[PDB]
Amino acid sequence: LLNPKAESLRRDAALKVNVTSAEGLQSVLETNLGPKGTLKMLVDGAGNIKLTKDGKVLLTEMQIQSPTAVLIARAAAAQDEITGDGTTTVVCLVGELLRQAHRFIQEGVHPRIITDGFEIARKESMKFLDEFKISKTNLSNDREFLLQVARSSLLTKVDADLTEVLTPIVTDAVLSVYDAQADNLDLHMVEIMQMQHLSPKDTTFIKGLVLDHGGRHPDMPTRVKNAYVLILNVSLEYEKTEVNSGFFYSSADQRDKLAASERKFVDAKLKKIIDLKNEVCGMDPFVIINQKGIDPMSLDVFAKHNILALRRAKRRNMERLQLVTGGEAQNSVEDLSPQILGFSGLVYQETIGEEKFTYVTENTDPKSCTILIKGSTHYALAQTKDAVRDGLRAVANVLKDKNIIPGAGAFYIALSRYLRSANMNKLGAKGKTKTGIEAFAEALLVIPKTLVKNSGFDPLDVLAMVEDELDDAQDSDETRYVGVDLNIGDSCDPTIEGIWDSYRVLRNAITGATGIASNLLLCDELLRAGR
Amino acid sequence: LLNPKAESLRRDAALKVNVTSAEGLQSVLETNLGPKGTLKMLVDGAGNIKLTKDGKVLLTEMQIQSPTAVLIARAAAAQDEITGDGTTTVVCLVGELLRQAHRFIQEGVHPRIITDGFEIARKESMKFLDEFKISKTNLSNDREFLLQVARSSLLTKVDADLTEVLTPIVTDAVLSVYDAQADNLDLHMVEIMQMQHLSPKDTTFIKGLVLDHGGRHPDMPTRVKNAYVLILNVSLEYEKTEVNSGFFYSSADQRDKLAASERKFVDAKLKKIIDLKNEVCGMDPFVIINQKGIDPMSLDVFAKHNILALRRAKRRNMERLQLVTGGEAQNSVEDLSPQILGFSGLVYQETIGEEKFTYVTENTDPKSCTILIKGSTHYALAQTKDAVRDGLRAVANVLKDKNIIPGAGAFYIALSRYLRSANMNKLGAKGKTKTGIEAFAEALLVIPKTLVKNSGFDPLDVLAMVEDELDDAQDSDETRYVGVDLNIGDSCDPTIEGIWDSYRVLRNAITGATGIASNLLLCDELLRAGR
Amino acid sequence: ERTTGRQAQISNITAAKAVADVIRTCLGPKAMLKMLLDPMGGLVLTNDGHAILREIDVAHPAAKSMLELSRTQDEEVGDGTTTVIILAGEILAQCAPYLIEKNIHPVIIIQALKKALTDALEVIKQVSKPVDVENDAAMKKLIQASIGTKYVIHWSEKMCELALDAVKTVRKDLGQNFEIDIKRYVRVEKIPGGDVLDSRVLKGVLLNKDVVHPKMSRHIENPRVVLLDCPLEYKKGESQTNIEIEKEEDWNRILQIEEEQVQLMCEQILAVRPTLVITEKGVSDLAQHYLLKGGCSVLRRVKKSDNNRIARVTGATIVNRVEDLKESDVGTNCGLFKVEMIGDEYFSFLDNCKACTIMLRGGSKDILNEIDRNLQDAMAVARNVMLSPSLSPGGGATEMAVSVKLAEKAKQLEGIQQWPYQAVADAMECIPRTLIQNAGGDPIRLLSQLRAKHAQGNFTTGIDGDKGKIVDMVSYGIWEPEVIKQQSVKTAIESACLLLRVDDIVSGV
Ligand SMILES: Nc1ncnc2c1ncn2[C@@H]1O[C@H](COP(=O)(O)OP(=O)(O)O)[C@@H](O)[C@H]1O
Ligand SMILES: Nc1ncnc2c1ncn2[C@@H]1O[C@H](COP(=O)(O)OP(=O)(O)O)[C@@H](O)[C@H]1O
Ligand SMILES: Nc1ncnc2c1ncn2[C@@H]1O[C@H](COP(=O)(O)OP(=O)(O)O)[C@@H](O)[C@H]1O
Ligand code: BEF
Ligand code: BEF
Ligand code: BEF
Ligand SMILES: [Mg+2]
Ligand SMILES: [Mg+2]
Ligand SMILES: [Mg+2]
């Protein structure tokens, strides 16, 4: 029943739509899944070309109007916003999940029975994962294992040769900021400075911190070799009266006397620092950075004493620099001690035509690196960053979660089979609820199939192989991990190839996709009221 | 690639659409399937209410724009145009067929493999039917068996109590026109006169032939009890010169002399008949029908001699009446013999206010009856006819094809199972072609499921029962027919309930649905060019 | 334009009846989800009645009155939302015939309905049994009851826990009734991801605001909290404060003063020896420095609601002017000051290892709102019992009891005054029926049996959800706060009584 206006897909039409859409979104992102995926090039309404193969990118970069396509998108973004990886997988999982479920809905089974099954299967899936995972020693310094995690979560979006270029640059970065002995890490301390010119293969890893805002003055230090570094944060430029003020000279040159009187507040606080570069290395063996400004006249003073003065720095660099050098983030200049500056070896300002680029090379206690992404154009400079992030938050996750999972869809093909023969002799489920867990089980085979569907070799066939080369080492006992070899068309050992799915991703992918799908299936009416 | 205008769903999108639509049309007609179906009431753009539950009706009565929905409609109409029954089944079969096939297409299998499978399965299905059927003796006079065929193909569109009213009226009709001793029959010889007033339960079976056009003259015979009947076909009214002519009287009364001269051509041929009703029963123990007209002055002549004169009769009644009476269809009156009139007992003209209704009761050699459909309104008078036809062409089919098939989806649940375990140990198929026959097999379960889906009892459950109560009499040997009992929810013996599917229908339903579906699946691009 | 007569009456009734019709398939343990589309953008995938009807604009006046019923009811108890709508309709609908068919005036039908309500309310308290508001186990299996019929059931136990563990936390008896302001003292915080179970009820607060300066404490062991209104920067005069200078070296003089007052301010704060200073307003860079070496971490910009909840789990009473900053305004009773970085987003905690902060985790920002609302229903029926330790026979049992005791009485009343009374009885029966329907069983069958079994054999006998057979409540139990059964019937009969007062409808301001 109703009131004018306001439309509403009801009965099984609403479910028809929901599944319809999901299945759809699924197919549209299947392409950019697996290392053997597809590179789309999408342009906006302004002509901003941008390349991708990261589900998230393609996803938040498009304008979707399908309600179901949103609830699935939002839940997928909420995944790259936590595990930073697997945004693509989750859309397939909620898609394929609804297809597998719609088959038993279509035959009669009340959706509430397929959802019940899902939860049951879900738990059993998350149990199985904790038994499937691979506790890896908190022992970092195993750069070998981590370099396989870098390449794993990189080939998923990289120019191949460039994978080998970024594989280290990412790992070393994560490590460089990570604090050994369990503890933790905050990726924000890995500046990701990016600059045009020279292809994205030329990008580099800086153990220190690279910046833009250089010393903007002629007679400045082109390169301060070996010196102190001052973390400054107080306004080194002209200021005004916080309360309404004005000058009123009655005398011809009284004007002048009042002229310098304004600037003098500067030098007041400005002297407290200039004598510090005397009070330390006042005879040569040096550079101030400052978050705020530095007007002309002042830049002279610093340029006069050969003090490389930088102004307007990225405010989060206070903390990043306070690790690249050690020196305290000096807010005010009053209580300023000469024993609190920081230290950096070569600190040189590479000028790239109008563009300034000051580096903070040679450090003692880095703890905060900078991945300098190079690249001829903007489209590449874009995607290259979106590759590093999706593969850096990827390594740092191997650390947070001291477990890892064999890739090539090993875990999926496993849980899939398990659940099948599980309830057959488990009955630790319910009545007609077996349907739902059966679906969920069959559902999971998305990733393995789609993984090869992209490669080429027939999904149905190659997946069949894994199902064989698998139980082969079961009828002979012993545990053997099996996955889909996306190069040949046979199975293989993920662990041996160097293929890993981050644990926290799988844990937030399954619990996620089910949350959506299972809540979508219980939907029976799509309103559209309330002008 | 392209030229302006002209759209075209391509790749798997075209197949997506095709299956999409089919599945759709399927669901829309599933409702009016089975005796426990749904009575829809559709009204056109003029307000002509009309009730139905006959797929064909609902189907040709709607305006469809989906290309796939047409190719499926047209092939379904082409079925009610041959077997006269099963228009609904065929739309489900091509629907469910595409769903079952799309599942293996969706996994990778090239459609050409699922079509190959279909043909293979098709043959095997049509073989199995010839082994499944039940040769029933050409021996008619088994009104008992035929009355079960009448009710079988009637409850599929009738008011229940009305089934019992029409069950005989149909059978007796088919028989009445059928020529025993193998031979053949032409249903056209069963007039289906329909008249308003008094509900469609009041309809009747006439062993003779009822007509409208009565004796249109006052002093006419209200009821010619026991008499001859003249099959006339020559114009008994005023005529004109086949070549341009005109009168030209020069004399006052020459006019008059020329007045009668025109009518005299009438009486010329009109006398040759009036003396025939003298030359036979010229002393009382009589009625002429005539396909053409009979002007006023002439009706007098016949009314004068008490000769019930009818004019403008349904031209196909020449042949129908030529069986209800025996008398030759007398075209011209010249060579008119008194030994060629026909004979009928009571031939009375029931006048129903302005409406004339002459009956040709009491016959010796009927061979052509008339099913008089009564009914208060037009909507009912409509549907009642569409029920008789779909159930009359249904009995006459049991005769043509001297075989019959147990209903309640017995044949389907059978062929389904057969094909499953067949290829398992048949391999009389092909390589990956097993998919297609597997689908086709699972597909068939449409009818049984949908049959109960309409009744109520859960499809999945009750069908499971048949699958059990079946092999029960297989693990114990002996043949036991099993079907779905749409009243309880258990299985039952179709043959025992009196449930039969006409053979020729099943033979033209399977070969039909496959023809469409299997040709739809091989479609890869929907053009729309050529303004 | 205008519509007087039964014309009016009818359209009102039908209108009201239609309102019900929409959410009737949302009352029951197998209740479906009405994914609604809001104008602003996003969606609502909830099945919680009031949360649906809110997202649907209506036209017919009655349909507007009928729609707000779900609101006032969602304000008394947190639960029983959908039920009031369905009842409120069936009442009007069940009157429809005797209203016009039996030509009974609206005054008379009202005089009876108002009467039948009171009697009906008796039968509610009559079948209601009291409960130990303190017995953790009873409260759980009570809260659990009103968690079924919602997406949050796959963790039912886990939910009642976070429910009780929060109702009781912000509670504070007080007597000279029990006051439980779930609203201002149980700020929820939905965080995307993890698992459901990965959610706890932190006894403190959780702000994502980081620390004002880099080299500042990431976590003080037992911090000394200081909460304040006023900002931390050079203030100005609330009058025409205009300075005129021609005295040369005077520029430096005033420009300095600013630093000086920021100093003073830092002093007054630093004085009571603080480690954590949280202000609602800003923090001058200067003030940061003097509070840095002053030995304390600073948090700028925090909502009043966010702040006043801190002042209940730190005791630290909030104070404006600092020259009045007392030492009683301590920061005692406050565990750690963690600052966990949750997926590229820093947070800050204040747990103690009077007001808690329920932190939910699920599988999407979307899925969480399901939980939050579902939870609210739990956390509300918990509060109800806390303030009325009485419960009613669930499974629609109570609803059927009143159906009989009323039906019986009505039949034994005699007078035109009987028909309207009779209808209230016939009406009530719809809830066990909607339940049995949304179950799948045969309504005419189960009801006749439920009703009969009721007529004699106990009154705590309702219908079982996922089953569809009539069961005794006591048996598998599913009592609900007696308060809900109050409102549901109080306002529903009122609604009906209002709309029945209408005999004319007109359009124009
Ligand atoms: N070379 C490989 N061979 C088999 N599987 C791999 C290979 N490299 C990574 N994969 C698979 O890539 C899948 C993830 O796809 P990806 O394109 O990274 O999307 P997302 O990571 O956003 O879900 C993982 O399930 C992993 O198993
Ligand atoms: N009472 C019955 N119980 C089980 N099957 C029956 C019964 N009566 C007829 N049917 C089924 O009706 C089906 C045909 O449906 P119908 O509505 O007649 O559509 P159409 O004949 O146009 O396909 C047949 O397959 C037959 O098995
Ligand atoms: N577990 C259940 N089994 C049978 N009835 C239930 C069950 N859970 C809720 N009920 C009944 O259904 C109604 C509550 O349903 P609900 O969908 O939660 O509506 P509301 O939004 O009013 O809470 C009450 O009458 C309650 O007695
Ligand atoms: F393509 Be995913 F985000 F790794
Ligand atoms: F409904 Be069918 F044409 F018998
Ligand atoms: F379903 Be109710 F609002 F708890
Ligand atoms: Mg990835
Ligand atoms: Mg039929
Ligand atoms: Mg509730």
Side-chain angles (χ1 to χ4, degrees), chain B residues 57 67 89 112 143 148 150 195 235 255 323 356 370 376 400 488 504 520 526:
Chain B
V57 176
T89 299
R112 292 205 84 84
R143 231 194 56 162
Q148 298 184 76
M195 196 34 90
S235 214
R255 265 160 161 290
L323 271 58
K356 294 296 182 183
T370 285
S376 290
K400 294 201 178 74
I488 316 167
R504 207 166 57 185
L520 266 173
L526 303 194

PDB file of all heavy atoms in Angstrom, chain B residues 57 67 89 112 143 148 150 195 235 255 323 356 370 376 400 488 504 520 526:
ATOM      1  N   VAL B  57      -3.323 -17.730 -23.494  1.00  0.00           N
ATOM      2  CA  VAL B  57      -4.224 -16.583 -23.348  1.00  0.00           C
ATOM      3  C   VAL B  57      -3.446 -15.385 -22.838  1.00  0.00           C
ATOM      4  O   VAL B  57      -3.251 -14.408 -23.550  1.00  0.00           O
ATOM      5  CB  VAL B  57      -5.363 -16.887 -22.343  1.00  0.00           C
ATOM      6  CG1 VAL B  57      -6.227 -15.660 -22.131  1.00  0.00           C
ATOM      7  CG2 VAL B  57      -6.205 -18.024 -22.855  1.00  0.00           C
ATOM      8  N   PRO B  67      12.890  -8.886 -27.053  1.00  0.00           N
ATOM      9  CA  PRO B  67      13.188  -9.788 -28.161  1.00  0.00           C
ATOM     10  C   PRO B  67      13.239 -11.230 -27.747  1.00  0.00           C
ATOM     11  O   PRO B  67      12.655 -12.085 -28.407  1.00  0.00           O
ATOM     12  CB  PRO B  67      14.531  -9.290 -28.644  1.00  0.00           C
ATOM     13  CG  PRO B  67      14.366  -7.854 -28.498  1.00  0.00           C
ATOM     14  CD  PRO B  67      13.812  -7.745 -27.101  1.00  0.00           C
ATOM     15  N   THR B  89       4.030 -24.781 -19.910  1.00  0.00           N
ATOM     16  CA  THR B  89       5.165 -25.645 -19.640  1.00  0.00           C
ATOM     17  C   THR B  89       6.365 -25.271 -20.474  1.00  0.00           C
ATOM     18  O   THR B  89       7.481 -25.184 -19.964  1.00  0.00           O
ATOM     19  CB  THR B  89       4.843 -27.121 -19.942  1.00  0.00           C
ATOM     20  OG1 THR B  89       3.769 -27.556 -19.102  1.00  0.00           O
ATOM     21  CG2 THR B  89       6.068 -28.006 -19.700  1.00  0.00           C
ATOM     22  N   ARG B 112      28.575 -23.596 -26.492  1.00  0.00           N
ATOM     23  CA  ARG B 112      28.474 -24.666 -27.473  1.00  0.00           C
ATOM     24  C   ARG B 112      28.565 -26.041 -26.821  1.00  0.00           C
ATOM     25  O   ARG B 112      28.131 -27.021 -27.411  1.00  0.00           O
ATOM     26  CB  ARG B 112      29.546 -24.540 -28.564  1.00  0.00           C
ATOM     27  CG  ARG B 112      29.373 -23.342 -29.488  1.00  0.00           C
ATOM     28  CD  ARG B 112      30.027 -23.578 -30.843  1.00  0.00           C
ATOM     29  NE  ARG B 112      29.163 -24.327 -31.762  1.00  0.00           N
ATOM     30  CZ  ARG B 112      28.210 -23.781 -32.523  1.00  0.00           C
ATOM     31  NH1 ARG B 112      27.991 -22.475 -32.484  1.00  0.00           N
ATOM     32  NH2 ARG B 112      27.469 -24.538 -33.326  1.00  0.00           N
ATOM     33  N   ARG B 143     -15.141 -44.639 -22.540  1.00  0.00           N
ATOM     34  CA  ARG B 143     -15.439 -43.289 -22.090  1.00  0.00           C
ATOM     35  C   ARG B 143     -14.905 -43.045 -20.704  1.00  0.00           C
ATOM     36  O   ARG B 143     -14.663 -41.902 -20.327  1.00  0.00           O
ATOM     37  CB  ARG B 143     -16.940 -43.009 -22.127  1.00  0.00           C
ATOM     38  CG  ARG B 143     -17.267 -41.720 -22.872  1.00  0.00           C
ATOM     39  CD  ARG B 143     -18.691 -41.256 -22.624  1.00  0.00           C
ATOM     40  NE  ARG B 143     -18.957 -41.083 -21.194  1.00  0.00           N
ATOM     41  CZ  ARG B 143     -19.966 -40.373 -20.697  1.00  0.00           C
ATOM     42  NH1 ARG B 143     -20.813 -39.762 -21.515  1.00  0.00           N
ATOM     43  NH2 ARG B 143     -20.129 -40.270 -19.382  1.00  0.00           N
ATOM     44  N   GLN B 148     -11.251 -39.133 -17.872  1.00  0.00           N
ATOM     45  CA  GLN B 148     -10.184 -38.787 -16.946  1.00  0.00           C
ATOM     46  C   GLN B 148      -9.231 -37.866 -17.671  1.00  0.00           C
ATOM     47  O   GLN B 148      -8.479 -37.131 -17.040  1.00  0.00           O
ATOM     48  CB  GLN B 148      -9.416 -40.012 -16.503  1.00  0.00           C
ATOM     49  CG  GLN B 148     -10.213 -41.040 -15.770  1.00  0.00           C
ATOM     50  CD  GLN B 148      -9.333 -42.172 -15.292  1.00  0.00           C
ATOM     51  OE1 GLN B 148      -8.594 -42.031 -14.319  1.00  0.00           O
ATOM     52  NE2 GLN B 148      -9.387 -43.299 -15.992  1.00  0.00           N
ATOM     53  N   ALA B 150     -10.409 -35.738 -19.930  1.00  0.00           N
ATOM     54  CA  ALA B 150     -11.186 -34.511 -19.979  1.00  0.00           C
ATOM     55  C   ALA B 150     -10.933 -33.713 -18.698  1.00  0.00           C
ATOM     56  O   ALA B 150     -10.576 -32.538 -18.751  1.00  0.00           O
ATOM     57  CB  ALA B 150     -12.667 -34.831 -20.132  1.00  0.00           C
ATOM     58  N   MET B 195     -23.735 -18.590 -25.894  1.00  0.00           N
ATOM     59  CA  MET B 195     -24.695 -17.527 -25.689  1.00  0.00           C
ATOM     60  C   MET B 195     -24.699 -17.027 -24.267  1.00  0.00           C
ATOM     61  O   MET B 195     -24.454 -17.789 -23.336  1.00  0.00           O
ATOM     62  CB  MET B 195     -26.100 -17.945 -26.083  1.00  0.00           C
ATOM     63  CG  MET B 195     -27.034 -16.739 -26.257  1.00  0.00           C
ATOM     64  SD  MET B 195     -26.212 -15.220 -26.929  1.00  0.00           S
ATOM     65  CE  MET B 195     -26.406 -15.409 -28.723  1.00  0.00           C
ATOM     66  N   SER B 235     -28.777 -18.075 -53.684  1.00  0.00           N
ATOM     67  CA  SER B 235     -29.425 -16.816 -53.324  1.00  0.00           C
ATOM     68  C   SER B 235     -30.908 -16.727 -53.597  1.00  0.00           C
ATOM     69  O   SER B 235     -31.353 -16.556 -54.731  1.00  0.00           O
ATOM     70  CB  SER B 235     -28.710 -15.637 -53.983  1.00  0.00           C
ATOM     71  OG  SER B 235     -28.762 -14.502 -53.134  1.00  0.00           O
ATOM     72  N   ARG B 255     -44.944  -0.309 -66.504  1.00  0.00           N
ATOM     73  CA  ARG B 255     -44.151  -0.207 -65.298  1.00  0.00           C
ATOM     74  C   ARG B 255     -44.420  -1.502 -64.562  1.00  0.00           C
ATOM     75  O   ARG B 255     -43.563  -2.384 -64.494  1.00  0.00           O
ATOM     76  CB  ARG B 255     -44.662   0.947 -64.434  1.00  0.00           C
ATOM     77  CG  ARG B 255     -43.955   2.251 -64.616  1.00  0.00           C
ATOM     78  CD  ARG B 255     -44.823   3.391 -64.109  1.00  0.00           C
ATOM     79  NE  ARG B 255     -44.028   4.584 -63.852  1.00  0.00           N
ATOM     80  CZ  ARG B 255     -43.155   4.684 -62.856  1.00  0.00           C
ATOM     81  NH1 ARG B 255     -42.984   3.659 -62.029  1.00  0.00           N
ATOM     82  NH2 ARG B 255     -42.438   5.792 -62.701  1.00  0.00           N
ATOM     83  N   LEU B 323     -23.902 -33.508 -41.917  1.00  0.00           N
ATOM     84  CA  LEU B 323     -23.561 -34.651 -41.103  1.00  0.00           C
ATOM     85  C   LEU B 323     -24.618 -34.734 -40.040  1.00  0.00           C
ATOM     86  O   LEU B 323     -24.970 -35.813 -39.614  1.00  0.00           O
ATOM     87  CB  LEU B 323     -22.197 -34.479 -40.445  1.00  0.00           C
ATOM     88  CG  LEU B 323     -20.956 -34.948 -41.197  1.00  0.00           C
ATOM     89  CD1 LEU B 323     -20.824 -34.259 -42.551  1.00  0.00           C
ATOM     90  CD2 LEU B 323     -19.749 -34.643 -40.339  1.00  0.00           C
ATOM     91  N   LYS B 356     -32.584 -15.193 -31.995  1.00  0.00           N
ATOM     92  CA  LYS B 356     -33.198 -16.409 -32.522  1.00  0.00           C
ATOM     93  C   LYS B 356     -32.208 -17.548 -32.276  1.00  0.00           C
ATOM     94  O   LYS B 356     -30.998 -17.350 -32.342  1.00  0.00           O
ATOM     95  CB  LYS B 356     -33.491 -16.247 -34.026  1.00  0.00           C
ATOM     96  CG  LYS B 356     -34.558 -15.191 -34.384  1.00  0.00           C
ATOM     97  CD  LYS B 356     -35.905 -15.588 -33.810  1.00  0.00           C
ATOM     98  CE  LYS B 356     -37.003 -14.620 -34.178  1.00  0.00           C
ATOM     99  NZ  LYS B 356     -38.280 -15.027 -33.511  1.00  0.00           N
ATOM    100  N   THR B 370     -22.502 -30.019 -31.238  1.00  0.00           N
ATOM    101  CA  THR B 370     -22.368 -28.596 -30.935  1.00  0.00           C
ATOM    102  C   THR B 370     -22.325 -28.404 -29.423  1.00  0.00           C
ATOM    103  O   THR B 370     -23.273 -28.769 -28.725  1.00  0.00           O
ATOM    104  CB  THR B 370     -23.574 -27.789 -31.525  1.00  0.00           C
ATOM    105  OG1 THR B 370     -23.413 -27.669 -32.942  1.00  0.00           O
ATOM    106  CG2 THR B 370     -23.675 -26.388 -30.918  1.00  0.00           C
ATOM    107  N   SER B 376     -23.473 -15.998 -18.055  1.00  0.00           N
ATOM    108  CA  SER B 376     -24.000 -14.669 -17.723  1.00  0.00           C
ATOM    109  C   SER B 376     -23.296 -13.474 -18.407  1.00  0.00           C
ATOM    110  O   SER B 376     -23.950 -12.608 -18.998  1.00  0.00           O
ATOM    111  CB  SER B 376     -23.960 -14.477 -16.192  1.00  0.00           C
ATOM    112  OG  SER B 376     -24.908 -15.293 -15.514  1.00  0.00           O
ATOM    113  N   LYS B 400      -5.632 -39.492 -31.488  1.00  0.00           N
ATOM    114  CA  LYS B 400      -4.676 -39.404 -32.577  1.00  0.00           C
ATOM    115  C   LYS B 400      -3.429 -40.203 -32.153  1.00  0.00           C
ATOM    116  O   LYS B 400      -3.046 -41.175 -32.812  1.00  0.00           O
ATOM    117  CB  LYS B 400      -4.328 -37.935 -32.863  1.00  0.00           C
ATOM    118  CG  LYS B 400      -5.488 -37.076 -33.399  1.00  0.00           C
ATOM    119  CD  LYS B 400      -4.954 -35.829 -34.131  1.00  0.00           C
ATOM    120  CE  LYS B 400      -6.056 -34.939 -34.729  1.00  0.00           C
ATOM    121  NZ  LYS B 400      -6.799 -34.138 -33.711  1.00  0.00           N
ATOM    122  N   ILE B 488      -1.974 -33.047  -0.770  1.00  0.00           N
ATOM    123  CA  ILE B 488      -1.369 -33.424   0.500  1.00  0.00           C
ATOM    124  C   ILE B 488       0.011 -32.786   0.598  1.00  0.00           C
ATOM    125  O   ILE B 488       0.222 -31.791   1.295  1.00  0.00           O
ATOM    126  CB  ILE B 488      -1.189 -34.951   0.584  1.00  0.00           C
ATOM    127  CG1 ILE B 488      -2.452 -35.657   0.078  1.00  0.00           C
ATOM    128  CG2 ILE B 488      -0.854 -35.349   2.013  1.00  0.00           C
ATOM    129  CD1 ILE B 488      -2.279 -37.150  -0.173  1.00  0.00           C
ATOM    130  N   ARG B 504       1.594 -36.274 -27.508  1.00  0.00           N
ATOM    131  CA  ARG B 504       2.067 -35.347 -28.527  1.00  0.00           C
ATOM    132  C   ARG B 504       2.477 -33.998 -27.966  1.00  0.00           C
ATOM    133  O   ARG B 504       3.251 -33.268 -28.591  1.00  0.00           O
ATOM    134  CB  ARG B 504       1.015 -35.168 -29.616  1.00  0.00           C
ATOM    135  CG  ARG B 504       1.613 -34.804 -30.961  1.00  0.00           C
ATOM    136  CD  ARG B 504       0.590 -34.986 -32.043  1.00  0.00           C
ATOM    137  NE  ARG B 504      -0.598 -34.186 -31.774  1.00  0.00           N
ATOM    138  CZ  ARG B 504      -1.707 -34.214 -32.509  1.00  0.00           C
ATOM    139  NH1 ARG B 504      -1.793 -35.011 -33.568  1.00  0.00           N
ATOM    140  NH2 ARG B 504      -2.730 -33.429 -32.192  1.00  0.00           N
ATOM    141  N   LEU B 520      19.413 -19.911 -28.288  1.00  0.00           N
ATOM    142  CA  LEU B 520      19.547 -18.630 -27.606  1.00  0.00           C
ATOM    143  C   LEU B 520      20.936 -18.557 -26.981  1.00  0.00           C
ATOM    144  O   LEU B 520      21.606 -17.519 -26.988  1.00  0.00           O
ATOM    145  CB  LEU B 520      18.483 -18.517 -26.501  1.00  0.00           C
ATOM    146  CG  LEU B 520      17.153 -17.827 -26.818  1.00  0.00           C
ATOM    147  CD1 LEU B 520      16.180 -17.972 -25.649  1.00  0.00           C
ATOM    148  CD2 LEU B 520      17.416 -16.351 -27.117  1.00  0.00           C
ATOM    149  N   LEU B 526      23.270  -8.837 -29.795  1.00  0.00           N
ATOM    150  CA  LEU B 526      21.929  -8.408 -30.187  1.00  0.00           C
ATOM    151  C   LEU B 526      21.930  -7.096 -30.942  1.00  0.00           C
ATOM    152  O   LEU B 526      21.901  -6.021 -30.345  1.00  0.00           O
ATOM    153  CB  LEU B 526      21.024  -8.252 -28.980  1.00  0.00           C
ATOM    154  CG  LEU B 526      20.849  -9.458 -28.082  1.00  0.00           C
ATOM    155  CD1 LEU B 526      19.654  -9.138 -27.213  1.00  0.00           C
ATOM    156  CD2 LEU B 526      20.626 -10.758 -28.868  1.00  0.00           C
TER     157      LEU B 526
END
